[model samples]
Target: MGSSHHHHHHSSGLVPRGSHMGTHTPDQSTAYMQGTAQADSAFYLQQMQQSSDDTRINWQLLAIRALVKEGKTGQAVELFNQLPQELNDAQRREKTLLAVEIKLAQKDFAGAQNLLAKITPADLEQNQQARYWQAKIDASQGRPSIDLLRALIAQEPLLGAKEKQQNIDATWQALSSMTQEQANTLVINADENILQGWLDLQRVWFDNRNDPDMMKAGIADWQKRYPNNPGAKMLPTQLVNVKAFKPAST
Candidate 1:
């Protein structure tokens, strides 16, 4: 060990905010890990108390994430607005994404779309998330939804198995919710065999929903026609899985 007289390399004065040499402290690392990691808001709240000025911003961002995850959108936005504007590019981009999510949660489609415009995603996941948000906004705003939802389902290879199932279910829900006239227009416009398959499945479901025998036969025919369709691979609950989902007798 050296002598007790040691020089501390603490750079005084207002060092440029951009000068974060990419080093992380123990507490900062813990804050980052837990904050970026999961669902325990109590731990995140406690971590905020341990955070120093340097790590406070990190903790704040983490807290905002925690609040958002907890569905406290109002609190999240309140915390988000308090974030200093001097964040580096990465932090700034993350802040913007967080804001977009907040806008979406609040059902402010215009605000969400405007924020989405400012985002130029730097990674594959970011691009995918942005596209998902765009599709969601389209569905909510009454734009041509089937094609966008279908496109989202088409990208299921990029998603995990659970996420792919979610995408398929969501696509089916949106498609099935449409009126017969709406579904027919989609049928006329559909060009891809996969698109036609999805529309046809919706038709069979709509037409034969009340009669289990007809529904079973209709579903069998649809399966025969579109053996390779994604919907065929993982049928929605509202469709052919009728034994488990049969309506009660009136």
Candidate 2:
């Protein structure tokens, strides 16, 4: 629930691909959801305000959601303050999470955390969109929970490989500072080559720590040391081999 990229496709797949944002009629609800409604701010707000659906409890809240996505936060808060009566259980929760994101975007981390603390684990378990917002809260503070990250990384078919790889790389980069046994626990589920590639990297960094001319001097020996490992084979071309950086002189 803490990440910007994790909006669960709404309606839980109950609705069609693009219809979950609001109405089926051409009242600009879909347009605002799709980002096209903002072009005519006056008319758009009118469309939202004039709507009569009881279920559209807080049209202004939807407007705030759109406005925050548009990064119009200072005004977003203004619209937020003008809501009538109060939010119901669900709408209130949604607005709170949205406000958390707006606060985070404004670099108001302190204010964001106040709302962040209000989001209960039970609440997040019920909604991935909420979880996405929570992830934003954690990442902005630089303390993304490993279990959360691993879950995101493990979203293979749903999450495209490129994003998954970025997650994996970030995971290993964090592990790079841990003990071998500590690192091995996470590697049990990692790709074999990636694990070995990391071990190889650590070896190079270790050997070169006190030696100033390391990549230039020690890579060949390192290759000979792990001649048969696929990851080891790439270390030459990818990392250190000087000749690999240049075309043959002839």
Candidate 3:
């Protein structure tokens, strides 16, 4: 007789912070799962060399994106420059966006903005991507992106729940990272009650972050004040389990 047993794998609680991109090809997915951007880029480049099919440009795009993620902007730019001039309609738009992204990684805000003005997105998702890049450039150059990002958060439904949550969290992160004066200015200028409510929630969470009891109470206060705000429906993850917060050693 032969017997086999499999143990359930429990989470180690060391989960990484960012949204997972798990929709790539098998080899690319493996590279993504292992968190090896350099290797991932290498695989994509290898795939590009071996394949002359319709997916070759896609491979090149993935490699460039990976290189950008790895901070190899120069190499990414060189590769992007070599892309075929006569790509299909879908690839053409993506190539433009990728160029925008590359310019952004190089901190060429003006270049990114100029490229963004040249084309219109064919679909909702592509439009959102364009707007997302535009928002990033706006933020980097000290333009007002808070409202734009808030709008993006509302439009995240076009993506999915996961991407929606990511937009929410990223917006919260940007708001929380601002100074008191910055946050106050946003609250004062916020034209929408919903925007003002979100900024106010950031203030409450920021002020009482070190004290679990006070944080819980503050969140409750925020929920009551903004009963219909999107944040009221789902508080930021950090503030979600205040009861479980453990204070630092005194």
Candidate 4:
């Protein structure tokens, strides 16, 4: 957890395809657990006025969990901002972990890195999960390299002594054979059902760039599969970009 000082400025537009911010939205399976504890600003202000200190702190933890689950990253951050100024080192550490998770969901790799930068080496040495996520953030932000991947695998034992080690070893071996472009493509296009979804998507997108009907059908299929996800709405944008490039004839 040795801190590195650096600033990153990102364009607010859609990240390029194959970026670490994958096409999937934040996991919403646990969203309902967030409840009023993670509500917006006005609700929090009201809670402050009515609740005991202990109650407010408990509510903050609940809210953090909920916001992280909901993928409401900016809001989760706002809640973190509201924490009292007098929190102890332990409280700050817990909050940092929560913040790291939220930032990851929000696709804010730089922010996650900045938080990691502030942590002392001792904290990093003790918290393997935090280190693992930092590596993930690095990989996601287009810094994927064999060395970085190796570093990440090295940290896996901290997550689980036996199970995670085997998983990481397998993943690292696969990743070692890939070019950066191939690795990025695999992450973005890999399907849960297919080991090579990223490659499949690239082939399809490349071949069908001029096929408006195919584009429409793909968009429709994505909408049907991910009806509530922000990624669903983004499919049309992908089609538009491809249409602009229009594939060459054979």
Report the lDDT tens digits of candidate 4 across residue range 1-250: 7668545647555433232222232232113222212354344345433445533543454465446656776777776675553445544444565566567777776666555444332343344343434434353443433333333343443445443444333333334334546645443211132223222332344445467566546545544554432223333233344456455342
After aligning candidate 3 to the native by TM-score, how far in Å is the CA of 27 from where it should be? 11
TM-scores for the candidates: 0.53, 0.42, 0.47, 0.38
RMSD of each: 7.6, 14.8, 16.0, 20.0
lDDT of each: 0.56, 0.45, 0.57, 0.44
Give the range of the ten consecutive residues with the poorest summed lDDT in model 4: 28-37
Candidate 3 weakest lDDT stretch, 10 residues: 29-38
TM-score of 4: 0.38
Candidate 2 local lDDT, residue 194: 38
In candidate 1, stretches whose alpha carbon ends up further than 4 angstroms from where it belongs are 1-16, 20-66, 78-96, 109-155, 163-165, 184-197, 211-214, 223-228, 241-250
True-structure lDDT of candidate 4: 0.44
Q: Which of 2 and 4 is the better model by lDDT?
A: 2
* Model 4 regions lying over 4 Å from their true place: 1-62, 84-86, 120-142, 145-155, 161-250
Steric collisions counted per model: 0, 12, 0, 3
Encode model 3's per-residue lDDT on 10-39: one tens digit a residue.
Answer: 864544424323334546533432234346
List model 2 lDDT by residue over 49-142, tens digit each: 4544432334554565556656777766775665533455545555565566567567776676566545443343233333334444333353
- Choose 1 or 2, whichever is better by TM-score: 1
Give the Cα-based TM-score of candidate 2 against the true structure.
0.42
